[PDB]
Design an enzyme around this catalytic site. Structure first.
Site, PDB file in Angstrom:
ATOM      1  CG  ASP A 133       3.882   7.490   5.152  1.00 16.17           C
ATOM      2  OD1 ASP A 133       3.204   7.661   6.161  1.00 16.17           O
ATOM      3  OD2 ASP A 133       3.072   7.302   4.221  1.00 16.17           O
ATOM      4  CE  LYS A 135       2.481   3.541   5.086  1.00 14.58           C
ATOM      5  NZ  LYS A 135       1.461   4.566   4.593  1.00 14.58           N
ATOM      6  CG  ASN A 138       6.589   2.325   4.540  1.00 13.34           C
ATOM      7  OD1 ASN A 138       6.996   2.475   5.813  1.00 13.34           O
ATOM      8  ND2 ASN A 138       6.029   3.693   4.325  1.00 13.34           N
ATOM      9  CG  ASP A 151       6.035   4.736   0.329  1.00 14.35           C
ATOM     10  OD1 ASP A 151       5.829   5.712  -0.184  1.00 14.35           O
ATOM     11  OD2 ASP A 151       4.991   4.653   1.274  1.00 14.35           O
ATOM     12  CB  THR A 164       0.053   5.904   7.978  1.00 12.44           C
ATOM     13  OG1 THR A 164       0.358   5.889   6.530  1.00 12.44           O
ATOM     14  CG2 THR A 164      -1.064   5.210   8.278  1.00 12.44           C
TER      15      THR A 164
HETATM   16  C1  LIG Z   1       2.354   1.372  -3.871  1.00 11.15           C
HETATM   17  C2  LIG Z   1       3.057   1.598  -2.388  1.00 11.15           C
HETATM   18  C3  LIG Z   1       1.860   2.135  -1.394  1.00 11.15           C
HETATM   19  O1  LIG Z   1       1.852   3.501  -2.152  1.00 11.15           O
HETATM   20  C4  LIG Z   1       2.856   4.244  -2.242  1.00 11.15           C
HETATM   21  C5  LIG Z   1       3.772   3.546  -3.102  1.00 11.15           C
HETATM   22  N1  LIG Z   1       4.103   2.340  -2.329  1.00 11.15           N
HETATM   23  C6  LIG Z   1       5.548   1.703  -2.662  1.00 11.15           C
HETATM   24  C7  LIG Z   1       5.285   0.264  -2.659  1.00 11.15           C
HETATM   25  C8  LIG Z   1       6.570  -0.078  -3.131  1.00 11.15           C
HETATM   26  C9  LIG Z   1       6.858  -1.693  -2.985  1.00 11.15           C
HETATM   27  C10 LIG Z   1       5.882  -2.614  -2.533  1.00 11.15           C
HETATM   28  C11 LIG Z   1       6.105  -4.074  -2.443  1.00 11.15           C
HETATM   29  C12 LIG Z   1       7.429  -4.529  -2.900  1.00 11.15           C
HETATM   30  C13 LIG Z   1       7.813  -5.669  -2.883  1.00 11.15           C
HETATM   31  N2  LIG Z   1       7.382  -6.945  -2.673  1.00 11.15           N
HETATM   32  N3  LIG Z   1       9.039  -5.426  -3.306  1.00 11.15           N
HETATM   33  N4  LIG Z   1       9.538  -4.089  -3.352  1.00 11.15           N
HETATM   34  C14 LIG Z   1       8.301  -3.423  -3.087  1.00 11.15           C
HETATM   35  C15 LIG Z   1       8.126  -2.292  -3.431  1.00 11.15           C
HETATM   36  N5  LIG Z   1       7.789   0.803  -3.396  1.00 11.15           N
HETATM   37  C16 LIG Z   1       7.566   1.908  -3.267  1.00 11.15           C
HETATM   38  N6  LIG Z   1       8.744   2.854  -3.589  1.00 11.15           N
HETATM   39  N7  LIG Z   1       6.490   2.486  -3.008  1.00 11.15           N
END
Ligand SMILES: C[C@@H]1COCCN1c1cc(-c2ccc3c(N)[nH]nc3c2)nc(N)n1
Length: 277
Positions: A133, A135, A138, A151, A164
Site C-alpha cells: 500500500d 503511496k 505513507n 503504515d 489505495t
Molecule cells: C493512521 C495512518 C493511516 O491509516 C493507516 C495507519 N496509518 C499509519 C500512520 C502512521 C504515522 C502517521 C504519521 C506519522 C508521523 N508524523 N510520524 N510518524 C507517523 C506515523 N504510522 C503507521 N504505522 N500507520
C-alpha cells in the site's frame, strides 16, 4: 531491556494521523524529552472488525525493520482498552503535503527522492516483505527531509485486501495477488506524481480508476522529464514479470542503473543532504 512503558509515561499532544482503526498522536516521553508518534488502537474495535492479523502483521514487520528510510517501532504497551505502538516521529509529515505545497518536483528532487524510495524498497524486498500500500501519504519526511516509510498492517511477508485506488497494481484487480512488482508499480505511479503533480490514473470514482489501470490508460504531460518518463514506462507495465527491478528482470541492479539515476550515489543516500524543495 527497559521497563514496559505506560500512558502516564507520556505527555500526549496533537493528532498526527487518523485511520479506520487507529489514531496517531504525538507524545513526549517525560523521562527523556523524546518525541514519539504513538499509534493508538482500540482493542474492542480491532477484534470487532477482525483486524487482529493486520495489527499483528504491523507490529511484527515494523519491529524487524532496521533501516533509516523506515518508521521504526520502538515499543508497545496497552491499557484496559488500548494498544499503543511507539513509532518514529517524522516531523515534516507526508510526502503528499509537499507535492501539494510545491505543485510538482524538479528533476533534482524527483531523482533524489525516487532514489531513496527505491533504496528503501530494495531493503524491504530483500527481507521478503511487500508493502502493498505504498503511496505519498505513507512516505513521510523526517526533520532532516529524508523519507521514512510507514503504515505496514497491509504488508505481506513471503516465505485478500486492496490498497489505495490510484496505486493499485493490475495483478491485484485481475487475480487477487501481490508480488514485489506490486510495490514497483506503486513506485512508477509515485514518480509520475512527483513529476506531473498528479497520479497517472485518475477518474470520477474507484471503478473508473480501476478500469483505466487494467487498460493501462494514462499518459504523460509534455513537460515530463524524458528519462523519468522512460523509467516510468519500465515500471508501469501490465505484465508484472516485466517491471524493472523485479526478480525476472534481474532485480535492483538494472533498476538502479537506469539513466534517470545517472548522477546518484546509491551508497549513502541517508548521509547526503536532500536537495531543497
Ligand atoms: C493512521 C495512518 C493511516 O491509516 C493507516 C495507519 N496509518 C499509519 C500512520 C502512521 C504515522 C502517521 C504519521 C506519522 C508521523 N508524523 N510520524 N510518524 C507517523 C506515523 N504510522 C503507521 N504505522 N500507520
Amino acid at each position: 531491556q527497559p521497563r514496559k512503558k505506560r500512558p502516564e509515561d507520556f505527555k500526549f499532544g496533537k493528532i498526527l494521523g487518523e485511520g479506520s482503526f487507529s489514531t496517531v498522536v504525538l507524545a513526549r516521553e517525560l523521562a527523556t524529552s523524546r518525541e514519539y508518534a504513538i499509534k493508538i488502537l482500540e482493542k474492542r474495535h480491532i477484534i470487532k472488525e477482525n483486524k487482529v492479523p493486520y495489527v499483528t502483521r504491523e507490529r511484527d514487520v515494523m519491529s524487524r525493520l532496521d533501516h533509516p528510510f523506515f518508521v521504526k517501532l520502538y515499543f508497545t504497551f496497552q491499557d484496559d482498552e488500548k494498544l499503543y505502538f511507539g513509532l518514529s516521529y517524522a516531523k515534516n509529515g507526508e510526502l503528499l503535503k509537499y507535492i501539494r505545497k510545491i505543485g510538482s518536483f524538479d528533476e533534482t528532487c524527483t531523482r533524489f527522492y525516487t532514489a531513496e524510495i527505491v533504496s528503501a524498497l530494495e531493503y524491504l524486498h530483500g527481507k521478503g516483505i511487500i508493502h502493498r500500500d505504498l503511496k505519498p501519504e505513507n512516505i513521510l519526511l523526517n526533520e532532516d527531509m529524508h523519507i521514512q516509510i510507514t503504515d505496514f498492517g497491509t504488508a505481506k511477508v513471503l516465505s485478500s485486501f486492496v490498497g489505495t485506488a490510484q496505486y493499485v497494481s493490475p495483478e491485484l484487480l485481475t487475480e487477487k495477488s501481490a508480488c514485489k512488482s506490486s510495490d514497483l508499480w506503486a513506485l512508477g505511479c509515485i514518480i509520475y506524481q512527483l513529476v506531473a503533480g498528479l497520479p497517472p490514473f485518475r477518474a470520477g470514482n474507484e471503478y473508473l480508476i480501476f478500469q483505466k489501470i487494467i487498460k493501462l490508460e494514462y499518459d504523460f504531460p509534455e513537460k515530463f522529464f524524458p528519462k523519468a518518463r522512460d523509467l516510468v514506462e519500465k515500471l508501469l507495465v501490465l505484465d508484472a514479470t516485466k517491471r524493472l527491478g523485479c526478480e525476472e528482470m534481474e532485480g535492483y541492479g538494472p533498476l538502479k542503473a537506469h539513466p534517470f539515476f545517472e548522477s546518484v550515489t546509491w551508497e549513502n543516500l541517508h548521509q547526503q543532504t536532500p536537495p531543497k524543495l
